[PDB]
Amino acid sequence: EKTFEQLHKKCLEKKVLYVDPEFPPDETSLFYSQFVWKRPPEICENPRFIIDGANRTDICQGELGDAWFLAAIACLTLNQHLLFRVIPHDQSFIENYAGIFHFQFWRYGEWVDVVIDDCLPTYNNQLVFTKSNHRNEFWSALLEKAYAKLHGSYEALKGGNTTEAMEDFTGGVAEFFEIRDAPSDMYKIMKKAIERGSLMGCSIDDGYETRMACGLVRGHAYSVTGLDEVPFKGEKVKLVRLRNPWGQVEWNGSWSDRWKDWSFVDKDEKARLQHQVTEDGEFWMSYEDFIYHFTKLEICNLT
Ligand SMILES: [Ca+2]
Ligand SMILES: [Ca+2]
Numbered sequence: 641e642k643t644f645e646q647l648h649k650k651c652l653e654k655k656v657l658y659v660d661p662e663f664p665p666d667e668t669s670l671f672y673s674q675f676v677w678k679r680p681p682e683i684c685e686n687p688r689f690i691i692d693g694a695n696r697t698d699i700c701q702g703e704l705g706d707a708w709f710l711a712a713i714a715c716l717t718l719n720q721h722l723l724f725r726v727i728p729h730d731q732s733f734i735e736n737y738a739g740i741f742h743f744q745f746w747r748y749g750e751w752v753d754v755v756i757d758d759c760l761p762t763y764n765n766q767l768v769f770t771k772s773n774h775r776n777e778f779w780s781a782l783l784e785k786a787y788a789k790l791h792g793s794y795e796a797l798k799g800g801n802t803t804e805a806m807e808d809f810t811g812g813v814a815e816f817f818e819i820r821d822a823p824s825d826m827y828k829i830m831k832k833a834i835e836r837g838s839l840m841g842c843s844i845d846d847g848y849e850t851r852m853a854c855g856l857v858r859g860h861a862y863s864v865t866g867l868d869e870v871p872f873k874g875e876k877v878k879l880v881r882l883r884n885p886w887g888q889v890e891w892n893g894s895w896s897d898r899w900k901d902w903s904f905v906d907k908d909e910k911a912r913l914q915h916q917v918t919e920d921g922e923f924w925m926s927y928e929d930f931i932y933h934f935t936k937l938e939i940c941n942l943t
């Protein structure tokens with residue numbers, strides 16, 4: 641067991657790029673039961689670890705069913721100071737680059753360091769697994785690789801629970817809600833949770849194209865990224881903001897991006913709500929419609 645510092649320092653002196661003996665760039669690391677592995681400098685001219693900050697737009701699901709995990713990362717980015725425990729800032733392609741990176745996860749009641757080489761699965765020189773909106777940003781793809789290593793393979797990330805990942809990023813305690821049994825004050829419970837920095841997911845119980853007619857997807861982890869109140873036509877309306885970790889496929893009901901009655905909303909209020917018409921996976925919906933469609937709500941509470 642050599643540490644990140646040690647391995648990094650060594651590779652720099654040797655002038656060699658690191659290769660992970662524990663989790664090598666071959667089919668063992670992909671599955672337990674076809675892609676070319678490439679490092680980000682082999683993929684593009686000017687790769688970067690973090691560009692314009694690490695935020696939820698940098699998490700876009702690829703050809704692997706790990707939404708449960710990605711939704712949790714996206715939630716984590718809403719709490720930057722927690723985020724930078726999981727992701728060390730002092731990492732770069734343009735300075736002290738030795739093809740090695742690391743991340744931290746809460747496991748067994750303590751922080752543990754996962755080290756990886758920066759080889760990533762590609763096809764036609766593009767990432768097949770999770771990537772960022774920005775073709776040159778690689779933190780999220782690398783984090784996913786590190787989480788895969790922690791579970792033994794990329795395939796091991798197929799299916800899982802959002803709360804598992806939330807706990808692995810925070811060391812917090814999971815709390816579940818069946819939205820049918822929801823208390824009267826659950827908007828308030830969720831509001832206090834988001835303001836306290838707690839991570840929130842939700843889903844529609846089951847038992848890449850738009851699944852439902854309303855634009856939601858069944859059996860799919862969504863990140864809760866906002867809760868707010870807007871006064872519209874005299875009265876105040878409770879809203880919920882969600883993000884689909886696909887980065888695509890939004891709700892189309894009231895308060896959706898292209899909803900016309902956004903025109904009746906004040907221009908400053910729009911700004912406070914960060915309302916944009918963009919196919920980014922993120923959308924506002926009414927608290928009412930939210931409680932009506934979603935069935936499970938998962939909150940990971942901190943200390
Ligand atoms: Ca970014
Ligand atoms: Ca949107």
Ligand SMILES: [Cl-]
Nearest residue numbers: 688689732733
């Ligand atoms: Cl960089």
